[PDB]
Amino acid sequence: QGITFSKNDVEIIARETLYRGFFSLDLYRFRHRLFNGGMSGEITREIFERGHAAVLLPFDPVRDEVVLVEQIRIAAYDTSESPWLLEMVAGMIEAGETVEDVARREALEEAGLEVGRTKPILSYLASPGGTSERLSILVGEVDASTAKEDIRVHVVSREQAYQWVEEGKIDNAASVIALQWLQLHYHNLRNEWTK
Amino acid sequence: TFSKNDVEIIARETLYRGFFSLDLYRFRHRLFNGGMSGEITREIFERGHAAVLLPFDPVRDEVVLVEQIRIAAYDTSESPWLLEMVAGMIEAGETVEDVARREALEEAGLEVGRTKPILSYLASPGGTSERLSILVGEVDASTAKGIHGLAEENEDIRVHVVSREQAYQWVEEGKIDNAASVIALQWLQLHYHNLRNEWT
Ligand SMILES: Nc1ncnc2c1ncn2[C@@H]1O[C@H](COP(=O)(O)O)[C@@H](O)[C@H]1O
Ligand SMILES: Nc1ncnc2c1ncn2[C@@H]1O[C@H](COP(=O)(O)O)[C@@H](O)[C@H]1O
Ligand SMILES: [Mg+2]
Numbered sequence: 224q225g226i227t228f229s230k231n232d233v234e235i236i237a238r239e240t241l242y243r244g245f246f247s248l249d250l251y252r253f254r255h256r257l258f259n260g261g262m263s264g265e266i267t268r269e270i271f272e273r274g275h276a277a278v279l280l281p282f283d284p285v286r287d288e289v290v291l292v293e294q295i296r297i298a299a300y301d302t303s304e305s306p307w308l309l310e311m312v313a314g315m316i317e318a319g320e321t322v323e324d325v326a327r328r329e330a331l332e333e334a335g336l337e338v339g340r341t342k343p344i345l346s347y348l349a350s351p352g353g354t355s356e357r358l359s360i361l362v363g364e365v366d367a368s369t370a371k372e373d374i375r376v377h378v379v380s381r382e383q384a385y386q387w388v389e390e391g392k393i394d395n396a397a398s399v400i401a402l403q404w405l406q407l408h409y410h411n412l413r414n415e416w417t418k
Numbered sequence: 419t420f421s422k423n424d425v426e427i428i429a430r431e432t433l434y435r436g437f438f439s440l441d442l443y444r445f446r447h448r449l450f451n452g453g454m455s456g457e458i459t460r461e462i463f464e465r466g467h468a469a470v471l472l473p474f475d476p477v478r479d480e481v482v483l484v485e486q487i488r489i490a491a492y493d494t495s496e497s498p499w500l501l502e503m504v505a506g507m508i509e510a511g512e513t514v515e516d517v518a519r520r521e522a523l524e525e526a527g528l529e530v531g532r533t534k535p536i537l538s539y540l541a542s543p544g545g546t547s548e549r550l551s552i553l554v555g556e557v558d559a560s561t562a563k564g565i566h567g568l569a570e571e572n573e574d575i576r577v578h579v580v581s582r583e584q585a586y587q588w589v590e591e592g593k594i595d596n597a598a599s600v601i602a603l604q605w606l607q608l609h610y611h612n613l614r615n616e617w618t
């Protein structure tokens with residue numbers, strides 16, 4: 224069951240740089256196997272390359288609270304209520320860094336929070352038709368009574384945060400995914416982290 | 419509280435123009451301490467916006483997934499073939515619901531009955547403007563068969579009819595790990611009881 228093909232079923236002819244700045248835009252030139260047999264001809268796709276990221280949902284299991292960070296994301300401007308988004312702690316992963324190391328470090332730099340235990344939520348591709356970006360989300364144990372780019376730190380109840388997902392007030396993929404996951408898993412998580 | 423009035427977009431400079439575009443946003447914005455930032459620049463991948471349809475069969479408690487290659491998955495995935503939702507770009511002049519219903523037919527051979535909005539999200543707003551709007555669509559999952567996709571767009575698509583339980587377990591196992599599908603299936607895990615009642 225599940226996916227039909229493997230990495231061996233593609234031929235990446237070229238990854239040609241279209242733009243080289245802080246990030247990159249690459250033209251992938253490739254062929255790939257067809258479900259009915261044989262290979263495609265050459266196909267090209269423009270792919271935004273910005274490396275990958277670690278994401279941390281800071282959850283206080285004693286108080287049933289989430290810590291959110293607020294900062295401007297200018298790309299949200301054209302389609303959003305405001306470009307200041309309420310987000311998860313997150314950071315890009317640089318060479319040799321692990322997801323958990325980045326998540327724990329960014330919790331301290333962005334929320335002023337020390338993380339205790341962590342558990343994986345999931346790792347997802349943000350928009351794989353046009354970008355390679357993968358983001359790996361952890362939930363991290365925090366004490367939301369602990370006090371601390373231009374960031375403002377918010378502490379809200381889990382119920383409020385999830386209601387803001389339902390209402391569309393929180394609508395960035397990382398936060399939606401993490402908070403939907405929390406809504407599905409928080410009972411067991413509180414059990415585990417308050418035992 | 420800040421709003422768009424607290425942002426000055428000085429310019430958007432097109433850095434690359436092809437099928438998609440890369441723009442440099444040049445801007446200033448207020449700071450929480452009450453000042454105003456210096457000039458900030460961000461490279462923003464501009465690819466327009468998308469419609470996503472979660473095909474749900476409420477009689478059978480089944481979902482229809484589509485399988486297709488996403489070459490950008492190659493560097494970080496076991497395979498670049500992904501299990502995904504029906505989805506398409508919204509071209510100038512189109513609307514979310516019409517695109518969602520049309521792609522359901524083009525990509526999975528599905529006629530869609532009722533639809534309900536799930537949510538609209540920004541895929542990765544640090545680097546792209548892309549917003550995707552997810553609908554759940556009422557389908558008869560037994561009608562999804564075969565290979566679809568338009569060869570004019572080099573779409574080669576296989577359909578997978580599975581139980582909702584199996585689809586969500588694949589999210590848990592990492593076998594479904596693209597944002598649209600994760601968001602849709604997590605939403606469905608939270609709402610399927612009421613939705614099945616609604617559509618019964
Ligand atoms: N879209 C972008 N274009 C150019 N530089 C960026 C972009 N996103 C992030 N950066 C740089 O990376 C840093 C960290 O970004 P972030 O992880 O979004 O806080 C920023 O302070 C910028 O120096
Ligand atoms: N990253 C991309 N670069 C270039 N064209 C693309 C890209 N993604 C989608 N397309 C266009 O959309 C068709 C397939 O769309 P989709 O299957 O929705 O990604 C392709 O034949 C192209 O015309
Ligand atoms: Mg960050």
Ligand SMILES: [Mg+2]
Binds near residue numbers: 504505506521525
């Ligand atoms: Mg599609």
Ligand SMILES: [Mg+2]
Binds near residue numbers: 525
């Ligand atoms: Mg299509």
